[PDB]
């Protein structure tokens, strides 16, 4: 269902927004989950270019720079 | 109601016809004012899942 499928989101910063904050932070903090951004919701929180539209050129070019050298 | 409104706005409505008309208005306004909230909640869940 729509409300159930939105529950699962890779970015924990995104999940901490519309879900119950306490549980999300705990459940993520124990596993040491590493949020790579890559999404919209999370990038809005941190205040950088949305990885879409005008920003899509930027993020794309940065994403490839990663896992390289 | 089994006794409709036999008059219209060009003529006058008597006491009863208006009083009976009131529920339709108030229920109309209430329904919309609630349907406003329903729409918003829907968009929320939708944009969250996409």
């Amino acid at each position: 269902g729509i409300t159930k499928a939105s529950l699962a989101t890779e970015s924990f910063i995104s999940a901490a927004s519309f879900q119950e904050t306490t549980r999300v932070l705990t459940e993520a903090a124990v596993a040491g989950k590493r949020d790579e951004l890559r999404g919209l919701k999370e990038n809005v929180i941190v205040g950088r270019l949305i990885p879409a539209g005008t920003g899509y050129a930027y993020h794309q070019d940065r994403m490839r720079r990663r896992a390289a050298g | 109601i089994e006794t409709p409104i036999t008059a219209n706005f060009r003529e006058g409505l008597n006491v009863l016809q208006y009083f009976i008309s009131t529920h339709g208005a108030r229920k109309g306004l209430a329904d919309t004012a609630l349907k406003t909230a329903n729409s918003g909640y829907l968009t929320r869940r939708l944009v969250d899942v996409a």
Partner: peptide, 22 residues
């Protein structure tokens, strides 16, 4: 049934009360 709540039930996948079987 029908209306805006009907849409919400559809997108919510909710199983009807007395469903059929295939």
């Amino acid at each position: 049934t029908g209306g805006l709540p009907r849409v919400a039930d559809l997108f919510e996948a909710r199983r009807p009360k007395e469903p059929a079987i295939l």
